[PDB]
Amino acid sequence: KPTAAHALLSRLRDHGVGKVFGVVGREAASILFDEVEGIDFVLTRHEFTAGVAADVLARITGRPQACWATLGPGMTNLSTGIATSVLDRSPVIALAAQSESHDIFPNDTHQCLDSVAIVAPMSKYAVELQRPHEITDLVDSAVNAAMTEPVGPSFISLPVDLLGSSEGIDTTVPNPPANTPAKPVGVVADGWQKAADQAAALLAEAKHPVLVVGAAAIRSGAVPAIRALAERLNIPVITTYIAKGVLPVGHELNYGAVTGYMDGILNFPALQTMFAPVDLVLTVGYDYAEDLRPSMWQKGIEKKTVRISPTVNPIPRVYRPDVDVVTDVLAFVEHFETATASFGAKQRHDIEPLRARIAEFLADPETYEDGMRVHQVIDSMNTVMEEAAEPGEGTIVSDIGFFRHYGVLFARADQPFGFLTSAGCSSFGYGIPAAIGAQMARPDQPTFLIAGDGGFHSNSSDLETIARLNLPIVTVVVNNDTNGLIELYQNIGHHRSHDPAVKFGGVDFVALAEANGVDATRATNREELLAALRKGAELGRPFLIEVPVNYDFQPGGFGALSI
Amino acid sequence: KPTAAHALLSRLRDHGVGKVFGVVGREAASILFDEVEGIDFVLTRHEFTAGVAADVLARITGRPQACWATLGPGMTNLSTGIATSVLDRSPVIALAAQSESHDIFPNDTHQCLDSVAIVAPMSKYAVELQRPHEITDLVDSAVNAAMTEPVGPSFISLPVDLLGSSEGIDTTVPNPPANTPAKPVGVVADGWQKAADQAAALLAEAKHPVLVVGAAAIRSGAVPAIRALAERLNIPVITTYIAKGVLPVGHELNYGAVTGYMDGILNFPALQTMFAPVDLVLTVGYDYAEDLRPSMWQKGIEKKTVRISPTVNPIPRVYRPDVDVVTDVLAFVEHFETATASFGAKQRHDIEPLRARIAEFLADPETYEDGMRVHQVIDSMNTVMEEAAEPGEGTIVSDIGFFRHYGVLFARADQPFGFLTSAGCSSFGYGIPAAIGAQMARPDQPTFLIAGDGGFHSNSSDLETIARLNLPIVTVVVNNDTNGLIELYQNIGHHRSHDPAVKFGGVDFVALAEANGVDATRATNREELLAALRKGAELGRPFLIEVPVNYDFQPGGFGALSI
Amino acid sequence: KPTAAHALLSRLRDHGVGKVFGVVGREAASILFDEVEGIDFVLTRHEFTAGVAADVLARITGRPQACWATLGPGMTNLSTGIATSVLDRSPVIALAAQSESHDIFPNDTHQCLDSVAIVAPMSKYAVELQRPHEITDLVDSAVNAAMTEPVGPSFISLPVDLLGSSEGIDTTVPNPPANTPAKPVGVVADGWQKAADQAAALLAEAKHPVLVVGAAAIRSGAVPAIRALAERLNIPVITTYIAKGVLPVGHELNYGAVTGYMDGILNFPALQTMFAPVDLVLTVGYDYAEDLRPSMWQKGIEKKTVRISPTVNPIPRVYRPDVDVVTDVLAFVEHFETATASFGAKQRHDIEPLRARIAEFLADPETYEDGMRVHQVIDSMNTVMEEAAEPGEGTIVSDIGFFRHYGVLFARADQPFGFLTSAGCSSFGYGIPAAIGAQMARPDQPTFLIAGDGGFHSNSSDLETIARLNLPIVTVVVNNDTNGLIELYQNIGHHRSHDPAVKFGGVDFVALAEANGVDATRATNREELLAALRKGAELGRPFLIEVPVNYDFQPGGFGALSI
Ligand SMILES: Cc1ncc(C[n+]2csc(CCOP(=O)(O)OP(=O)(O)O)c2C)c(N)n1
Ligand SMILES: Cc1ncc(C[n+]2csc(CCOP(=O)(O)OP(=O)(O)O)c2C)c(N)n1
Ligand SMILES: Cc1ncc(C[n+]2csc(CCOP(=O)(O)OP(=O)(O)O)c2C)c(N)n1
Ligand SMILES: N=C(N)NCCCCC(=O)O
Ligand SMILES: N=C(N)NCCCCC(=O)O
Ligand SMILES: N=C(N)NCCCCC(=O)O
Ligand SMILES: [K+]
Ligand SMILES: [K+]
Ligand SMILES: [K+]
Ligand SMILES: [K+]
Ligand SMILES: [K+]
Ligand SMILES: [Mg+2]
Ligand SMILES: [Mg+2]
Ligand SMILES: [Mg+2]
């Protein structure tokens, strides 16, 4: 007779779920994962990989995804993936086993932790199953909470005895309709249209407005609408890290992405050039978690600001917009098109010196004694991605480190979510599972990953998962035998380094990949790197490329990082 | 120099607050309550009274209100008022003092409790002040969270040292605009208009539809729009306890309020009469906490259901509507008017047998040996309220007990919130604070309170507050020396009473009132009661009437209460 | 068949419980309270009264006691009683009903709150019943945690369906042994004997040592041991509020109790007299919550300190003793008797100017225009209590307010817990329930209560309970139409009053008591008061006395209140 295990997998399938990522423990006595046709288990080497792969799959598909862990330490390993999902905003259903219900004594029973209490502060919803047949409504409530803005994960704790139980379960009676939201449910304030009208009046009087676009605008389905608004009225578009690609590469209104590290990296007044003459900032789908902070746009002349978001402002201490429009992003744009219908196009401010500096970094022909420079690595990746991918296709994924902020400035994105990194959480080791998630969401597109030696090695065991699933991801490891970003912070704070806190011995990443069954090679210059990338791109199997790199810090150049 | 106490009162004033209800403790060394013109302290005898008075004032005005307690046991006493606000849904800012910041050791310092941890499970928002100048943004964040559906209380904990500090506070810089929401912010599903269209299509095919209206519809400002729709299409309106009055007394479409006790109280198939021939139930602003449960309308023929609510369904285990419309109630009705503009009037179902039974109870001419019956008491109150109030004015307030369900069935309500009682929380003692709130919200209207001996005496000390404020409330205490509802439940479960758990000795409430400075009299029949009420209504001062009553229990007739 | 209701009451009986205090709600359908012989329900007017009466009964008997509330607002009302028990340290089992187990949706179901989450921060143990037969082991675990130092309350949440269920229950099998601890289980550090020997070495070198005794010493059963030790070595004994009476009235080593208000009340350098020449302070059963703070004994010369407690020091920010002895108090005294066996008796220091000042207040012969003075009221109570009680018997109970600290200074205590007040929580309204608890623990001794108008009236409804139980308590209400303590704090912080936060209108407390069935009279001078008290003491029924009082503050005299 069918149990709560069958009822759970069956209800996930009603919500569109086809994959469950995770690591299975002793609950395997209660759940096989073959109970239900059309839903497959994806075994990873660590739970973090499972949670992040589901997060990225959820982001690109716009549908709820699922991950799985065992009791105790499985659940705690999964929590970093849950944390990724709450801060990066993706609808993940996280599931973990628990001790037999009559034996639940947290911190006393073997492997028994108070899972709901640990996960509740970092989730949209968190419950423990108590009566086997209720798992259907628990899944529904979890999906409901996950798909409400700010989107995030929901958690269900599953005692092994109840999971294997058929008490109260009747599969002859069909399940009620799932009614999965097509896009996230939002918060809407009374009179938002009047606030939108007030923003239109500010726009009329503005000489140099900009649109600053966040990931929430992509979730809402507002990209085509935003593009048409900016095009008609001649308004520049600036983005957060993952909102890169809302305009295609080469578009005249594509003014780039912001990272607080950009002035220090380029050795240039980059933020001043972007924002100094701007008099109106419209932050369309604003989220403070994406790390584009008001302090960053506050350059030069005084500005008016308009916040548009499907949530009430959580941070009035930091951001007090002149006009606050609490509504669905697409709904705002469609109303705003009506309010600005008869407006004349603007004159946009000049940022050519900034564009030249960036182009100069990408074209950098110099060779160096201590390896390549990261901007040269990314230029090579851009070239081969453009070759390998159809127009508007392809994904570059970035792990976390100093190199990541080079990705923000320099990486090609020819579609929304075409450059993927961790927006709010920024856990190192993100890259592999995000590349797994990206390649599964876009099976016929090229997927390149860039990672640093510190972050890559924190989670490199799931190379074996990439080989086992035969996912044709091409990985570049930029290696400096250091947690580089942290050495920068040491110098910023103390004006010197302390090696015991940041420095590694050597790891042969080529030999490491090959030990996992992934073909690999070392590249030490542009020519060797282009050849490696093109070989990887056409291989039909995963490929890894190790590149020696180095940084030259200017610690005085990073005042924009202050909080 | 102005302190955080001044900045706190000033920001409340900015959100429209004119009264702070509470009991002040040793934090009086940091806050006098004379700092800001236009905001006055209202001292009560118990913190429960303060929280409920603020709750009721918030409900009637639709504006955030404020209450105040000291540290430790002050905060725990206030928490029953907070629980009222969370379950009854009203926007209250609850403020409590805390131990000096450097001396916060919960359960170790004198009177030190972990206030945030204790209140967080029953609030929209809960925070402890840490930096004195931030009090302004904490008040804003509290109001934001309180005024989002489901509306509820927000809590700020105030260490006494920081409350009296002026560090970082500069009142030469004016506060930014308050932007207080004019009605609650709601959640809104994408494609709600299509769902509203599916609802119109169900109505098109229905023979006997009904509108079941809850408090959320009133908060949304939807009463006049709901009435116009009901009148155009000849659709009957049924209500929860506190949505009584959405239609005037006498209106032909006013089919009454529902209580799970109605069949038992009337010895009549009341729910079957209301719901049996109905084929479509629209639950307009549904909230389970109001205790109109799906089991109550599931009588007779199979029905389709439409849920309309500014929240995602929190209870799919219990309620699975055929159509779910997640949106602002008024927005739903306005869309629905357009979608049903071509529709004509339905034939409504006949409930005259139920109207006859109710009328029989109210007209009951018998004189009993053992005191009055509660239905005779309410009929006398109805009579004088009609005499005393202008058309569409007056409030009858009810405390909690068996008699309260007679109020639901029998009490007059000639306006929205014209009959006030506690919907979700149902704490005994509610009556006095609710009458204080109502009389302050409607200063020129008559306010009657009905309370039983058990619940009234639990909180009778605030009779002094009524005297001190000179609020012309007329109170009727229905005395049977028993927790009557609880004796009913003993008999339902065990088929007998147990007196030590439910019976009191005698309290002379006339003498009790007079000890508090409130004139009072005893009434034992309709003629005595009418005369006492008429004198009460014209007195220009508070007045109390004690009436001996008895209940004729039929414990086997309450099957509708099963959960 | 016996249900979990039977199993619960029966397991309470096994732990020596004979009374359950509280208010029953709709869970009366599942529990009558006649299931088990030897355990009786005690019905109160408010849940706060039920919690305090159990706490006080537990404190005096040294045995676990029990209280009861309904779901939602029953539980939150009880929670002020739970807070009393956690801060004042008494082993109370607190029990509250909950929604039916399958219908638990906190803040969504009618009267449903997350009880365990609300209570957990203020309790030793908190759990919800899930499987009916497990109630036996939940009671045992509740008792285990409550009877471990620091002693405090344990909480069990009881869903009404499980409470009424017989699933898994078999009463033909006897319960396992209860094994209730005779005295609290305590924390013991390795090498405490060495630390005790270090303390003995400090005592040898000290010219003027003192013993500061707290409530934990009494709980340990260490009173005779401490007295014998102090008498041999000629060491003065100073006490916290409820440790008054560890030495009999008039004993020469009885140096009195400490309150931070003492210098301000006495208009005298009282703390300087007590502590200035002291070179060694041994704090025996120290507990910061009792509000005898290190700052209070830090007068005159530098001191060494010894902390003895059955708990690890929770406040090293505030109190860093020279020697820390973590062990059972009686165990320390017995070891300390051996380590100091050969010591010569000490020369104790002079406090006669303070003794003379206290005696002067007690004998005050002036007749005032505006009422009696509180020291005159307490003097009168002392006289009649001495007349009425056997040697080493009688209880004076104090509620909370400015008069309470007069009680600390002036009130007679001829046995441990002979003067009773709230040590750590200090909730007003404490007096009535504490007098109920005291009178039931000491059925053959006189019980006097002193209370102020503010605190008393916050909880005056339980006068009916006293009347109903026929408890021969004699109550004195000292009336000044003010929350007097709070007016003092206004003057301390601001140098002026603000009446809206502190002032009441007239309440006739004689008339109020008579309305509740309690004989009462008004007294305005010593002669009338003594006559009223002597009448009350020989009445054999409860009696209430109202006394007009006034205070004349010197707000500059309260610097010792600084934190
Ligand atoms: C889970 C986690 N722990 C610690 C950090 C701090 N941290 C951020 S990025 C990073 C990696 C830096 O090293 P690497 O991947 O080699 O990038 P690099 O800065 O050298 O370019 C570290 C250690 C982190 N981001 N996440
Ligand atoms: C704070 C709280 N504790 C307990 C209850 C359970 N309860 C509900 S109403 C009530 C009082 C019922 O007696 P009364 O007010 O005299 O009205 P009656 O039932 O006699 O008509 C009680 C004890 C409650 N509602 N609230
Ligand atoms: C539950 C609670 N709320 C508020 C306080 C602050 N407070 C302490 S005692 C007290 C009463 C003081 O008035 P009264 O009982 O008349 O004694 P008085 O100070 O006038 O002597 C108050 C309001 C408190 N202790 N407990
Ligand atoms: N604006 C800032 N200071 N941002 C901090 C960035 C730290 C996260 C990261 O770069 O991985
Ligand atoms: N549907 C029910 N069983 N309702 C129970 C309501 C209990 C609270 C009351 O009667 O006020
Ligand atoms: N040391 C102090 N400041 N004590 C404050 C105690 C205030 C509570 C009371 O006096 O009842
Ligand atoms: K191409
Ligand atoms: K790992
Ligand atoms: K009239
Ligand atoms: K005597
Ligand atoms: K009370
Ligand atoms: Mg590195
Ligand atoms: Mg009654
Ligand atoms: Mg007073």
PDB file of C-alpha atoms in Angstrom, chain B residues 24-26 28-34 41 43 45-47 73 76-77 79-80 83 86-87 89 100 102-103 105 107-113 117-118 121-122 288-289 291 293 314-315 317-318 423-428 453-454 457-458 460-461 464 468 486 489-490 493-494 496 498 500-505 507-508 511-512 515-516 563, chain C residues 24-26 28-34 41 43 45-47 73 76-77 79-80 83 86-87 89 100 102-103 105 107-113 117-118 121-122 288-289 291 293 314-315 317-318 423-428 453-454 457-458 460-461 464 468 486 489-490 493-494 496 498 500-505 507-508 511-512 515-516 563:
ATOM      1  CA  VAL B  24       3.635  53.253  33.001  1.00  0.00           C
ATOM      2  CA  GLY B  25       6.373  51.756  35.209  1.00  0.00           C
ATOM      3  CA  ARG B  26       9.855  52.941  36.209  1.00  0.00           C
ATOM      4  CA  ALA B  28       8.723  57.188  33.700  1.00  0.00           C
ATOM      5  CA  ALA B  29      12.235  58.448  34.594  1.00  0.00           C
ATOM      6  CA  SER B  30      12.898  58.479  30.789  1.00  0.00           C
ATOM      7  CA  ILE B  31       9.404  59.320  29.455  1.00  0.00           C
ATOM      8  CA  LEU B  32       6.861  61.733  30.930  1.00  0.00           C
ATOM      9  CA  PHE B  33       4.270  61.663  28.055  1.00  0.00           C
ATOM     10  CA  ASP B  34       3.961  65.467  27.890  1.00  0.00           C
ATOM     11  CA  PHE B  41      -1.638  59.221  27.750  1.00  0.00           C
ATOM     12  CA  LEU B  43      -4.008  55.320  32.010  1.00  0.00           C
ATOM     13  CA  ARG B  45      -5.957  49.694  35.676  1.00  0.00           C
ATOM     14  CA  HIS B  46      -4.567  46.706  33.726  1.00  0.00           C
ATOM     15  CA  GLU B  47      -2.450  46.397  30.535  1.00  0.00           C
ATOM     16  CA  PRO B  73       5.244  41.486  33.846  1.00  0.00           C
ATOM     17  CA  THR B  76       3.403  39.764  29.637  1.00  0.00           C
ATOM     18  CA  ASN B  77       0.128  41.452  30.727  1.00  0.00           C
ATOM     19  CA  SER B  79       0.522  40.206  25.547  1.00  0.00           C
ATOM     20  CA  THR B  80      -3.120  39.160  25.962  1.00  0.00           C
ATOM     21  CA  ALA B  83      -2.911  38.206  21.064  1.00  0.00           C
ATOM     22  CA  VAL B  86      -3.125  39.309  16.084  1.00  0.00           C
ATOM     23  CA  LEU B  87      -6.179  37.024  15.992  1.00  0.00           C
ATOM     24  CA  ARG B  89      -6.546  41.570  12.993  1.00  0.00           C
ATOM     25  CA  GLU B 100      18.995  49.068  30.785  1.00  0.00           C
ATOM     26  CA  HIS B 102      24.119  46.873  29.196  1.00  0.00           C
ATOM     27  CA  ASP B 103      22.144  44.969  31.899  1.00  0.00           C
ATOM     28  CA  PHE B 105      20.216  39.213  31.160  1.00  0.00           C
ATOM     29  CA  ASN B 107      15.533  35.555  33.610  1.00  0.00           C
ATOM     30  CA  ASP B 108      18.592  36.803  35.594  1.00  0.00           C
ATOM     31  CA  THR B 109      18.266  40.577  35.919  1.00  0.00           C
ATOM     32  CA  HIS B 110      15.392  41.818  38.086  1.00  0.00           C
ATOM     33  CA  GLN B 111      12.172  42.008  35.990  1.00  0.00           C
ATOM     34  CA  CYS B 112      14.165  41.089  32.828  1.00  0.00           C
ATOM     35  CA  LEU B 113      12.408  38.879  30.274  1.00  0.00           C
ATOM     36  CA  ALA B 117      11.339  36.147  21.797  1.00  0.00           C
ATOM     37  CA  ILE B 118       8.067  35.945  23.759  1.00  0.00           C
ATOM     38  CA  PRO B 121       5.317  34.350  17.599  1.00  0.00           C
ATOM     39  CA  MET B 122       2.167  36.531  18.027  1.00  0.00           C
ATOM     40  CA  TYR B 288     -10.890  31.211   9.258  1.00  0.00           C
ATOM     41  CA  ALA B 289     -10.040  32.943  12.566  1.00  0.00           C
ATOM     42  CA  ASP B 291     -14.850  30.951  13.137  1.00  0.00           C
ATOM     43  CA  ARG B 293     -16.017  27.328   9.157  1.00  0.00           C
ATOM     44  CA  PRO B 314      -3.289  29.480   4.843  1.00  0.00           C
ATOM     45  CA  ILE B 315      -5.598  26.473   5.411  1.00  0.00           C
ATOM     46  CA  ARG B 317      -6.347  21.186   4.796  1.00  0.00           C
ATOM     47  CA  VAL B 318      -9.717  22.721   5.715  1.00  0.00           C
ATOM     48  CA  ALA B 423     -13.640  37.384  16.610  1.00  0.00           C
ATOM     49  CA  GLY B 424     -10.397  35.360  16.720  1.00  0.00           C
ATOM     50  CA  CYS B 425      -9.142  35.721  20.267  1.00  0.00           C
ATOM     51  CA  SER B 426     -12.314  35.655  22.424  1.00  0.00           C
ATOM     52  CA  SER B 427     -10.636  36.582  25.727  1.00  0.00           C
ATOM     53  CA  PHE B 428     -13.109  37.090  28.562  1.00  0.00           C
ATOM     54  CA  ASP B 453     -20.572  37.690  35.479  1.00  0.00           C
ATOM     55  CA  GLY B 454     -17.542  35.427  34.810  1.00  0.00           C
ATOM     56  CA  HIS B 457     -15.464  40.251  36.812  1.00  0.00           C
ATOM     57  CA  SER B 458     -12.166  39.075  35.273  1.00  0.00           C
ATOM     58  CA  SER B 460     -14.034  44.793  36.260  1.00  0.00           C
ATOM     59  CA  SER B 461     -11.466  47.146  37.841  1.00  0.00           C
ATOM     60  CA  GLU B 464     -12.822  53.220  37.490  1.00  0.00           C
ATOM     61  CA  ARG B 468     -12.389  58.834  35.312  1.00  0.00           C
ATOM     62  CA  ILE B 486     -17.942  26.090  30.396  1.00  0.00           C
ATOM     63  CA  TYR B 489     -19.063  22.092  27.597  1.00  0.00           C
ATOM     64  CA  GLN B 490     -18.845  19.878  30.736  1.00  0.00           C
ATOM     65  CA  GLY B 493     -18.343  15.998  27.022  1.00  0.00           C
ATOM     66  CA  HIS B 494     -19.341  14.215  30.234  1.00  0.00           C
ATOM     67  CA  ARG B 496     -22.838  16.253  33.857  1.00  0.00           C
ATOM     68  CA  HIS B 498     -18.591  19.639  38.068  1.00  0.00           C
ATOM     69  CA  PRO B 500     -15.659  23.431  41.561  1.00  0.00           C
ATOM     70  CA  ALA B 501     -14.579  24.180  37.931  1.00  0.00           C
ATOM     71  CA  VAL B 502     -17.402  26.609  37.007  1.00  0.00           C
ATOM     72  CA  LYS B 503     -19.424  28.054  39.988  1.00  0.00           C
ATOM     73  CA  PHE B 504     -18.854  31.325  41.835  1.00  0.00           C
ATOM     74  CA  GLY B 505     -20.288  32.794  45.041  1.00  0.00           C
ATOM     75  CA  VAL B 507     -20.976  39.311  43.656  1.00  0.00           C
ATOM     76  CA  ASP B 508     -23.122  42.424  43.944  1.00  0.00           C
ATOM     77  CA  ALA B 511     -22.447  47.812  44.661  1.00  0.00           C
ATOM     78  CA  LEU B 512     -19.242  46.965  42.739  1.00  0.00           C
ATOM     79  CA  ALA B 515     -17.532  51.512  44.679  1.00  0.00           C
ATOM     80  CA  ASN B 516     -15.838  52.598  41.390  1.00  0.00           C
ATOM     81  CA  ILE B 563     -13.855  20.180  14.759  1.00  0.00           C
TER      82      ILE B 563
ATOM     83  CA  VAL C  24     -11.229  26.125  32.760  1.00  0.00           C
ATOM     84  CA  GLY C  25     -12.281  26.840  29.169  1.00  0.00           C
ATOM     85  CA  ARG C  26     -13.884  24.669  26.473  1.00  0.00           C
ATOM     86  CA  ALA C  28     -14.012  21.115  29.999  1.00  0.00           C
ATOM     87  CA  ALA C  29     -15.426  18.751  27.320  1.00  0.00           C
ATOM     88  CA  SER C  30     -12.250  16.630  27.738  1.00  0.00           C
ATOM     89  CA  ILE C  31     -11.452  17.141  31.458  1.00  0.00           C
ATOM     90  CA  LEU C  32     -13.922  17.486  34.375  1.00  0.00           C
ATOM     91  CA  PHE C  33     -11.384  17.539  37.271  1.00  0.00           C
ATOM     92  CA  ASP C  34     -13.149  14.806  39.272  1.00  0.00           C
ATOM     93  CA  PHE C  41      -9.612  22.163  41.254  1.00  0.00           C
ATOM     94  CA  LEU C  43     -11.179  28.206  40.436  1.00  0.00           C
ATOM     95  CA  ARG C  45     -11.283  34.934  38.580  1.00  0.00           C
ATOM     96  CA  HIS C  46      -8.136  35.451  36.425  1.00  0.00           C
ATOM     97  CA  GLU C  47      -5.341  33.074  35.367  1.00  0.00           C
ATOM     98  CA  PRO C  73      -5.777  34.120  25.787  1.00  0.00           C
ATOM     99  CA  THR C  76      -1.228  34.453  27.681  1.00  0.00           C
ATOM    100  CA  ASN C  77      -3.047  35.435  30.906  1.00  0.00           C
ATOM    101  CA  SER C  79       2.063  33.658  31.241  1.00  0.00           C
ATOM    102  CA  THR C  80       2.439  36.536  33.743  1.00  0.00           C
ATOM    103  CA  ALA C  83       7.106  34.837  34.464  1.00  0.00           C
ATOM    104  CA  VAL C  86      10.752  31.937  36.385  1.00  0.00           C
ATOM    105  CA  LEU C  87      12.103  35.151  38.021  1.00  0.00           C
ATOM    106  CA  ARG C  89      12.301  30.712  41.240  1.00  0.00           C
ATOM    107  CA  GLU C 100      -7.488  20.137  18.323  1.00  0.00           C
ATOM    108  CA  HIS C 102      -5.199  18.432  13.366  1.00  0.00           C
ATOM    109  CA  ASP C 103      -6.501  22.065  13.506  1.00  0.00           C
ATOM    110  CA  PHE C 105      -2.672  26.814  12.640  1.00  0.00           C
ATOM    111  CA  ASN C 107      -2.733  32.950  14.306  1.00  0.00           C
ATOM    112  CA  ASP C 108      -5.176  31.393  11.775  1.00  0.00           C
ATOM    113  CA  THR C 109      -7.400  29.020  13.751  1.00  0.00           C
ATOM    114  CA  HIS C 110      -9.837  30.578  16.255  1.00  0.00           C
ATOM    115  CA  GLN C 111      -8.015  31.103  19.597  1.00  0.00           C
ATOM    116  CA  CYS C 112      -4.918  29.341  18.252  1.00  0.00           C
ATOM    117  CA  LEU C 113      -1.521  30.691  19.389  1.00  0.00           C
ATOM    118  CA  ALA C 117       7.129  29.254  21.214  1.00  0.00           C
ATOM    119  CA  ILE C 118       5.596  32.004  23.381  1.00  0.00           C
ATOM    120  CA  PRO C 121      11.910  31.793  26.659  1.00  0.00           C
ATOM    121  CA  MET C 122      10.323  32.164  30.167  1.00  0.00           C
ATOM    122  CA  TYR C 288      20.999  38.747  40.919  1.00  0.00           C
ATOM    123  CA  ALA C 289      17.247  38.613  40.215  1.00  0.00           C
ATOM    124  CA  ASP C 291      17.821  42.896  43.216  1.00  0.00           C
ATOM    125  CA  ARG C 293      23.201  44.346  43.495  1.00  0.00           C
ATOM    126  CA  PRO C 314      25.402  34.011  34.833  1.00  0.00           C
ATOM    127  CA  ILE C 315      26.507  37.683  35.248  1.00  0.00           C
ATOM    128  CA  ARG C 317      29.896  41.530  33.555  1.00  0.00           C
ATOM    129  CA  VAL C 318      28.336  42.653  36.868  1.00  0.00           C
ATOM    130  CA  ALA C 423      11.548  38.929  44.567  1.00  0.00           C
ATOM    131  CA  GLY C 424      12.440  38.970  40.844  1.00  0.00           C
ATOM    132  CA  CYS C 425       9.290  39.611  38.801  1.00  0.00           C
ATOM    133  CA  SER C 426       7.484  42.367  40.792  1.00  0.00           C
ATOM    134  CA  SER C 427       4.094  42.247  39.066  1.00  0.00           C
ATOM    135  CA  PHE C 428       1.465  44.403  40.718  1.00  0.00           C
ATOM    136  CA  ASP C 453      -4.519  51.118  45.560  1.00  0.00           C
ATOM    137  CA  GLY C 454      -2.784  50.785  42.139  1.00  0.00           C
ATOM    138  CA  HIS C 457      -7.142  47.116  42.072  1.00  0.00           C
ATOM    139  CA  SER C 458      -5.305  45.686  39.049  1.00  0.00           C
ATOM    140  CA  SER C 460      -9.087  42.973  43.078  1.00  0.00           C
ATOM    141  CA  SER C 461     -11.672  40.592  41.563  1.00  0.00           C
ATOM    142  CA  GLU C 464     -14.534  36.738  45.616  1.00  0.00           C
ATOM    143  CA  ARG C 468     -15.574  31.624  48.420  1.00  0.00           C
ATOM    144  CA  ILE C 486       5.769  55.792  39.324  1.00  0.00           C
ATOM    145  CA  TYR C 489      10.260  58.023  39.103  1.00  0.00           C
ATOM    146  CA  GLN C 490       8.712  60.958  37.194  1.00  0.00           C
ATOM    147  CA  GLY C 493      13.931  61.747  35.943  1.00  0.00           C
ATOM    148  CA  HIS C 494      12.184  65.065  35.221  1.00  0.00           C
ATOM    149  CA  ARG C 496       8.055  67.112  38.130  1.00  0.00           C
ATOM    150  CA  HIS C 498       2.575  64.264  35.033  1.00  0.00           C
ATOM    151  CA  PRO C 500      -2.278  61.589  33.277  1.00  0.00           C
ATOM    152  CA  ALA C 501       0.332  58.781  33.617  1.00  0.00           C
ATOM    153  CA  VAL C 502      -0.083  58.212  37.398  1.00  0.00           C
ATOM    154  CA  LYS C 503      -3.355  59.528  38.930  1.00  0.00           C
ATOM    155  CA  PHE C 504      -6.656  57.750  39.619  1.00  0.00           C
ATOM    156  CA  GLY C 505     -10.087  58.888  40.827  1.00  0.00           C
ATOM    157  CA  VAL C 507     -12.244  53.900  44.580  1.00  0.00           C
ATOM    158  CA  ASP C 508     -14.167  52.913  47.735  1.00  0.00           C
ATOM    159  CA  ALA C 511     -17.627  49.093  49.525  1.00  0.00           C
ATOM    160  CA  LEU C 512     -15.656  47.060  46.945  1.00  0.00           C
ATOM    161  CA  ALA C 515     -19.673  43.757  47.047  1.00  0.00           C
ATOM    162  CA  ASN C 516     -17.449  40.619  46.912  1.00  0.00           C
ATOM    163  CA  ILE C 563      22.006  50.896  37.090  1.00  0.00           C
TER     164      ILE C 563
END
